[PDB]
Design a protein that fits this description.
part of a larger assembly; 4 chains; A: two-stranded antiparallel ribbon; B: mainly beta; 22-stranded antiparallel β-barrel; 11 helices; 7% helix; binds a molecule of 7 linked components (FRU-FRU-FRU-FRU-FRU-FRU-FRU); binds chloride ion; binds magnesium ion; signal (chain A)
């Protein structure tokens, strides 16, 4: 009667009661890291590259405009629906990174320090993770729900709103998590997947840099650049913070995208993709699953643009062609080029990721688009085909860390807040841009031979150190970020921060319709397309709580 | 049950479709009972009683020889069935078990009769041919089409990196017209794939053979009886490398001890079924791959795409490579009982049933390499094992009493149920020999993975039910249940489900002395509630699983807890943890279907012209519902909750005419026609915007039929540029494209322009059996129809646009050879284009079609060698017959596919031609 | 701190078919039986097994193969044999005296 | 028709054995006593920790 319906208990799971336990607390912090390598999928790389197709760095690529149609629409800024499955996707996905970081914190809050000497260091790790999610989430959507109450009960999540805080108070909440991390993270983390203190400082400084170009008006246009914020970018990129955790610029530019040089001194914080590791095919970077070129039979997404390729040209003395670079294509015999081109972009006639036996061609063997999306290939996230680190599951994936913060990113974030403060520190932004620039100048290991073999002419020199105008120094900073971080999916995000998106990519739309048919119907709509729409399924379920962005 | 709502089945007609599955024969035989199945050789179906009862499981409950089971019928011997009644309202079914909500099918197997030693041998053999051959472009049509789509866009039609070279120009009006065309001998630059013109549906299909043999033996003494059935079935499906077989044995027996007081008996069936099944989505692959791809390469190998052809695989390869993935299934089923009669009218009997199945299989991964369609060189094997061990025990007391005027029966008792499942599996990679002989787990060189879990549930159920009849004139019945369940916490375990029913046999009221033309006429009315607990064995709980990452996952997103926290790059075991799979609900209770049913029976001249009609109001409340989480809740926010409700009203009518004619011919009719409306009343808010049950997540399904859908409206196609400019501003519209309606007249076509465009319900379904019997010869036809049903065509995306598909250059149906252009303006089909700029894939009225039909589900013709000739062979029964199943279909002119009963991608329903006999001593 | 579980499964599927003919005859003095026939046998075996290590809860309830954090191993093979056998045997008895 | 159960708790602690058993045998004599048809059949679930 009663002995009978209590006998059958659940198998192979841990229950709501038990997961609190201290025995499991460190399982939850790992599980919370895991989802960064195991929660994305081929259309939702926590690289946000699917969504960086909007930019002038690249096209989506693939079979054609119906191979991922919702991402075409983002690429031309026409046709985007708020129902679109992809936007609901990334929105749901990043909030489930958060639940892991939050469940860990709900258990870690109950721990006692005298018997768990790490307690706070572990809380900081989890909080850092939590900011990473909100940050990217904020980048995608602007008007996001802050989930920072780890002891909040399930039914409390319907009474949440993405307008509880204001667009700046929302940015400050992301900083509150990164700030805490700075205070309590170790100086050096020996378990390299855990962020160290300089990583929290880096992401914190990144958060302020995005918080300072303010949009306190009701639309997405800029309402000034907050002085007090930029002064916090410089604080938490102080060379002394970074030197305590040993980070710096790699000797040769290419190391940040090779698997032998994983976890370098420029890898400030990086997702630890792994192989031969207990899992089914391995914790490979499935997110880049589609960007492998046709030479593996699929799929040919994430193709760099003729805009970006020409962006690597330089003039007689080795400086970019700010005005004219994009008026005739790069031709290797006669133009001067930044080495960084042959680290970012695998072009026809050249080796595929430094393997002189895979030569790339305007061919069924490399591009899937029959010419539509061009014939360029992304090199950063792809690897040598003979790598021990590549493996075909359902797509071709590898063990190559995605670096969330390259140390070059902190030097350019520092040089940026310097140039915006305009307080006579401009000669230091230039020294910063010059570090990034003359490393690139001599990043010819793995491509040393490219002159005699192909006639390429590397010319890249650092800028003379005068007291540049705020704006004239700005374009040299903007150009350095364009060539340093090509195809790493934080380009379009650069522009929406600057309030420049509608202008440069609508201009990219018409220069690049010559090179890529798809951009012929394209139109970026000011105060609308700077941000993905908040997903309609979320809005409609919140009962008027959640609020759309200006434009829909 | 004389007060219920009970469709009875003529089990004789059942075998005249030669189905393996008895339920597949009942298709359309019973009003209100929608039986639905594809053409696959196991005959497996799904039953739906009275619309769509609830939001979780709608599968009915079978009670075979007193034992419950919710699965099978296609796993058992349909040939040793003797009785089948479907019980449709809450009252008649409510007492047969704790799971009646979705209807209750009583099934009674054969057994020996007092004083008889009969024996029957039945034996059949059929051929099955592919009916619904979907017409897809050949290598030259695919050439004409691609030229059109290329020019319609004004780019050079020779810029195809395929083997095509064109010869074209402009006519008088300056329109693109095509003259001739030339094609390469080889599809790729290295000349390793010949260009071909294959008919992939001719290739992947064969002529199936079906085959059945049953042997029944009986024996009946006064002190007990016994039965013994033997039987085999073998169906080679119409898809190559798919088959099914069943071996079956049943032994039933009873013993009458201690005069005829103490009785002891047992039913028991034994079954080994075995199958290799069609792979997931081969029909869609066969639609997609161009004719130009050859079955085989220049060398021996299988053909695939090379150079510039689409990302689609070899359908003859996949069907071969999967030819060895055979499960084999052993299901023991039966009961045992004791029955005591301490004094006349009072019986104490208790049954004990056993339903145990095990299912072994080895699934083989071989390396493939058709064209650019690689696998690397993966080899692996997975040895899966599964167990379901169900058992039931009950005990029953019954006193019947006839006062003199009156009659009355009483029953009380209790029932116990416990399913205990498990399943485990060993997977290993790398094999130096790729045969099922070498490919065992000890022969592996590579990595392995282990998998396996278990679960179960126990059921307790106290019940009573009581009857009465004044004097064959006025009939009452009442039932009261108290059902508990393992799935719920202590605070909601047991609910209480009472039911009432009435009946008035108006003909025995000799106030109808007069009317002689009318033998019976009976008015009955039901009200009852039936509990539903058919939910996850883990619904109550908050589920944290450790999920390392060890399982296959597509495109990523394994949601694994393991992570290289050390930066190792792996090589060794990683630290891991726990993810959340769900969130608890302490307060889940039963869901309750309440069914109210009214009906009348009747019987007219000589008891020819018989039938019955019924009207129900079926309502499920406190519906148990897998309630999606809120977005910001994130991972594993699903939880079970009793939020939701749904109703189901309708009419069920069966009516048949018997009579002989004086010239030897006998003719017997048996039609039936149902209808019903289904509406969702309430629903939690996440389930609403989920669209899970209807809204496509644009609108909410509350107020509409379960599965209703929302989309745009296809006002034809733009025919000239001024219909575009005067239309609402619509992104990507031009002369050629589909015009979409402006439903809020805001002057722009955006996503707000969608309304309810699909309702899956039929405006009435029906079926009719005709029997003719003239001078030994017997002929039977069973028709079945469904008029009113809407149908969402996903094939139309492949037959009406060069680019309503995610990847370029797929094969496309034949229809687009008839698309619009300047040159051909008498067509609905929008002009070919290479790019879907008008998003013609969006949910349109374009894809909603009249899927109504009437099929000749079966036709049979036989001869019965008269007893004079057969009985010198010393035989009671000698009959030869021959049948056709699904021989012919009739459908709407505005339906573009082949089989409207299966428009898209499921296993084609084939046409069977059958031969057989019935020896019977 | 080893924990692990191994889920083993084994199958033996043996079957036999034979057919027999027998004529017995009582002459009057004598008696005699004759039998001929054939028999077929086929055993087909198999056995397979999944093994996994590491369990955060050490009960038969938690300790299934999906709950494992550690390394796994798979095992399993099959084998069999078929038998054919033609036979006869014949009897006699003079008169309950000599058999 | 045979039904039967056995349960032996061994003399070593944490060792036992059980057996559930069912047998149904039956013959039929058809066509006077010429044609005969029959079946024997036993069903068993044994379970042990050794
Ligand atoms: O349309 C609404 C629909 O979108 C969904 C699901 O599709 O999004 C949710 C969720 O699903 C994904 C991934 O799981 O959807 C994939 C999505 O990505 C795109 C572009 O974004 O590109 C996919 C590319 O993959 C390929 C690769 O094929 C491979 C190569 O390694 O070759 C064979 C052939 O498939 C495979 O073994 C390999 O994967 O295609 C896979 C893609 O194509 C589809 C088309 O149905 O599968 C092909 C299969 O379909 C069949 O017809 C029937 O099974 C067979 O012919 C064949 O097996 C689709 O199921 C697969 O996802 C390459 O061709 C593509 O370039 C889009 O094209 C694609 O839609 C994620 O985006 C997202 O997170 C749901 O919400 C909703 O159901
Ligand atoms: Cl719980
Ligand atoms: Mg509108």
């Amino acid at each position: 009667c009663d002995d009978f319906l209590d006998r059958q208990v659940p198998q192979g799971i841990v229950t709501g009661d038990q997961i609190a336990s201290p025995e499991y607390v460190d399982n939850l912090v790992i599980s919370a890291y895991a989802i960064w390598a195991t929660g994305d999928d081929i259309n939702s790389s926590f690289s946000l590259w699917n969504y960086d197709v909007r930019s002038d760095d690249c096209y989506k690529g693939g079979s054609g405009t119906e191979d991922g149609g919702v991402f075409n629409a983002l690429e031309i800024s026409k046709g985007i629906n708020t129902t679109d499955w992809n936007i609901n996707d990334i929105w749901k996905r990043l909030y489930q990174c958060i639940t892991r970081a939050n469940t860990a914190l709900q258990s870690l809050d109950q721990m006692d320090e005298k018997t768990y000497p790490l307690k706070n260091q572990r809380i900081a790790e989890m909080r850092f993770l939590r900011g990473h999610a909100h940050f990217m989430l904020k980048q995608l959507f602007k008007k996001i729900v802050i989930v920072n109450d780890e002891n909040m009960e399930p039914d409390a999540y319907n009474e949440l709103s993405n307008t509880t805080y204001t667009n700046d108070e929302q940015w400050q909440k992301i900083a509150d998590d990164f700030q805490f991390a700075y205070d309590n993270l170790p100086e050096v983390q020996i378990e390299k997947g855990r962020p160290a203190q300089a990583a929290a400082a880096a992401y914190l400084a990144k958060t302020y840099l995005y918080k300072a170009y303010r949009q306190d008006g009701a639309d997405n246009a800029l309402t000034g650049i907050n002085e007090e914020d930029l002064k916090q970018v410089v604080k938490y990129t102080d060379p002394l913070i970074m030197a305590k955790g040993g980070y710096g610029l790699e000797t040769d530019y290419s190391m940040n995208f090779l698997p032998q040089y994983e976890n370098g001194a420029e890898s400030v914080w990086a997702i630890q993709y792994s192989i031969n590791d207990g899992t089914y095919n391995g914790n490979l970077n499935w997110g880049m699953g589609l960007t492998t070129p046709q030479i593996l039979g699929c799929c040919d997404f994430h193709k760099p643009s003729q805009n970006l390729v020409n962006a690597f040209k330089t003039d007689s003395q080795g400086k970019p062609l700010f005005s004219t670079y994009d008026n005739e294509n790069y031709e290797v015999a006669t133009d001067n080029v930044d080495p960084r081109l042959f680290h970012t972009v695998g072009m026809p006639g050249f080796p595929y990721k430094y393997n002189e036996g895979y030569i790339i061609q305007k061919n069924d063997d490399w591009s899937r688009s029959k010419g539509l999306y061009g014939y360029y290939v992304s090199l950063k996230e792809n690897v040598d085909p003979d790598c021990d680190c590549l493996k075909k599951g359902s797509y071709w994936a590898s063990s190559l860390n995605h670096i969330v913060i390259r140390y070059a990113d902190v030097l350019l974030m520092r040089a940026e807040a310097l140039i915006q403060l305009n307080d006579g520190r401009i000669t230091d932004a230039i020294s910063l841009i010059n570090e990034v620039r003359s490393r690139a100048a001599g990043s010819t290991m793995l491509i040393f031979n490219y002159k005699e073999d192909y006639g390429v002419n590397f010319k890249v020199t650092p800028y003379d150190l005068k007291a540049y105008a705020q704006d004239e120094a700005m374009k040299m900073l903007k150009w350095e970020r364009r060539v340093e971080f090509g195809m790493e999916s934080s380009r379009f995000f650069d522009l929406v921060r600057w309030g420049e998106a509608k202008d440069v990519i609508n201009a990219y739309y018409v220069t690049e319709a010559s090179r890529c048919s798809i951009y012929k119907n394209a139109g970026f709509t000011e105060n609308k397309n700077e941000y993905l729409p908040v997903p309609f399924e979320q809005i409609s379920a919140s009962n008027g709580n959640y609020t759309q962005n200006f434009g829909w | 049950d004389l007060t219920g709502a009970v469709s009875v089945v003529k089990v004789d007609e059942i075998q005249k479709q030669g189905e393996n599955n008895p339920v597949k024969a009942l298709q359309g035989r019973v009003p209100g009972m929608n039986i639905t199945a594809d053409g696959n050789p196991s005959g497996s179906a799904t039953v739906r009683i009275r619309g769509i009862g609830t939001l979780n499981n709608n599968d009915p409950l079978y009670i075979i020889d007193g034992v419950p089971t919710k699965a099978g019928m296609h796993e058992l011997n349909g040939n040793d069935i003797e009785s089948i009644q479907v019980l449709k309202d809450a009252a008649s079914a409510s007492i047969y078990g704790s799971r009646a909500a979705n209807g209750v099918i009583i099934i009674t197997t054969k057994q020996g009769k007092k004083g008889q030693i009969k024996i029957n041998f039945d034996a059949s053999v059929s051929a099955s041919m592919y009916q619904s051959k979907m017409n897809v472009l050949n290598t030259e049509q695919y050439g004409r089409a691609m030229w059109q789509a290329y020019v319609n866009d004004g780019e050079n039609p020779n810029g195809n990196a395929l083997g095509y070279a064109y010869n074209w120009g402009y006519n008088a009006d300056g329109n693109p017209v095509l003259y001739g065309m030339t094609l390469s001998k080889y599809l790729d630059s290295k000349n390793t794939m010949p260009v071909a013109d294959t008919d992939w549906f001719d290739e992947i299909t064969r002529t199936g053979v079906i085959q059945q043999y049953n042997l029944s033996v009986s024996n009946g003494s006064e002190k007990g009886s016994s039965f013994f059935s033997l039987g085999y079935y073998k169906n080679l499906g119409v898809i190559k490398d798919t088959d099914f077989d069943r071996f079956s044995a049943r032994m039933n027996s009873d013993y009458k001890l201690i005069d005829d007081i103490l009785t002891i008996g047992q039913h028991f069936t034994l079954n080994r079924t075995s199958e290799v099944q069609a792979p997931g989505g081969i029909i869609e692959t066969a639609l997609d791959i161009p004719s130009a791809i050859p079955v085989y390469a220049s060398d021996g190998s299988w053909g695939g795409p090379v150079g510039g052809w689409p990302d689609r695989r070899n359908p003859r390869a996949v069907l071969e490579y999967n030819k060895d993935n055979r499960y084999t299934y052993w299901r023991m089923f039966g009961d045992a009982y004791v029955n005591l009669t301490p004094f006349k009218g009072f019986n104490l009997r208790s049954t004990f049933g056993l339903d145990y199945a095990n299912k072994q299989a080895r699934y083989f991964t071989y390396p493939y390499q058709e064209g650019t369609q690689t696998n690397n060189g993966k080899s692996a094997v997975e040895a899966k094992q599964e167990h379901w061990t169900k058992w039931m025990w009950n005990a029953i007391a019954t006193y019947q009493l006839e006062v003199g005027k009156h009659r009355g029966d009483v029953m009380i008792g209790m029932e116990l149920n416990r399913e205990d499942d498990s399943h485990f599996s060993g997977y290993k990679e790398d094999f130096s020999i790729l045969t099922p002989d070498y490919m065992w787990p000890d022969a592996g060189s590579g990595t392995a993975q282990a998998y396996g879990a278990g679960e179960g549930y126990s059921l307790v159920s106290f019940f009573g039910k009581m009857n009465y009849s004044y004097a064959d004139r006025y009939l009452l019945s009442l039932t009261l249940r108290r059902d508990g369940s393992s799935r719920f916490g202590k605070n909601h375990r047991y609910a209480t489900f009472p039911s009432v029913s009435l009946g008035w046999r108006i003909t025995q009221e000799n106030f109808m002395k007069e009317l002689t033309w009318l033998d019976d006429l009976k008015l009955r009315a039901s009200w009852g509630q039936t509990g539903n607990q058919e939910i996850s064995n883990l619904a109550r709980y908050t589920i944290y699983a450790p999920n390392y990452g060890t399982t296959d996952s597509f495109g990523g997103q394994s949601y694994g807890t393991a992570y290289d926290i050390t930066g190792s790059n792996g090589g060794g075991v990683l630290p891991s943890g726990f993810k959340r799979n769900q969130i608890g609900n302490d307060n889940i209770k039963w869901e309750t279907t309440t069914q109210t049913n009214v009906g009348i029976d009747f019987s007219l001249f000589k008891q020819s012209l018989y039938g019955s009609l019924e009207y129900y109001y079926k309502k499920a409340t406190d519906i148990l519902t897998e309630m999606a989480g809120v977005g910001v809740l994130g991972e594993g926010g699903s939880r079970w909750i009793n939020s939701g409700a749904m109703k189901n009203q309708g009419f069920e009518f069966n009516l048949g005419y018997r009579n002989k004619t004086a010239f030897g011919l006998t003719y017997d009719l048996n039609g039936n026609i149902s209808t019903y409306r289904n509406e969702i009343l309430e629903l939690p808010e996440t389930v609403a915007a989920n669209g899970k049950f209807g809204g496509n997540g644009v609108k909410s399904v509350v107020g509409h039929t379960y599965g209703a859908q929302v989309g745009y409206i296809a006002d034809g196609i733009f025919k000239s540029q001024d219909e575009v400019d005067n239309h609402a501003t619509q992104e990507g519209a031009a002369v050629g494209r589909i015009r979409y309606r402006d439903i809020d007249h805001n002057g722009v076509i955006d996503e707000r322009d969608q309304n309810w465009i699909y309702d899956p319900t039929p405006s009435f379904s029906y079926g009719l059996n005709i029997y003719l019997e003239y001078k030994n010869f017997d002929l039977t036809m069973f028709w079945q129809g469904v008029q009113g049903v809407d149908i969402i065509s996903d094939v139309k995306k492949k037959s009406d646009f060069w680019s309503a598909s995610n990847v370029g250059f797929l094969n496309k149906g034949t229809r687009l050879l008839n698309a619009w252009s300047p040159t051909n303006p008498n067509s609905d089909i929008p002009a070919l284009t290479r790019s879907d700029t008008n998003n013609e894939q969006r949910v349109s009225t374009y894809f909603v079609e009249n899927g109504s039909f009437l099929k000749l589900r079966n036709i049979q013709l036989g001869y019965t060698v008269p007893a004079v000739i057969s009985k010198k062979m010393r035989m009671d029964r000698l009959r030869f017959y021959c049948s056709a199943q699904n021989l012919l279909t009739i459908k709407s002119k505005n339906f573009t596919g082949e089989d409207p009963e299966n428009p898209n991608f499921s296993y084609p329903i084939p046409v069977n031609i059958t031969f057989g006999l019935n020896i019977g001593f």
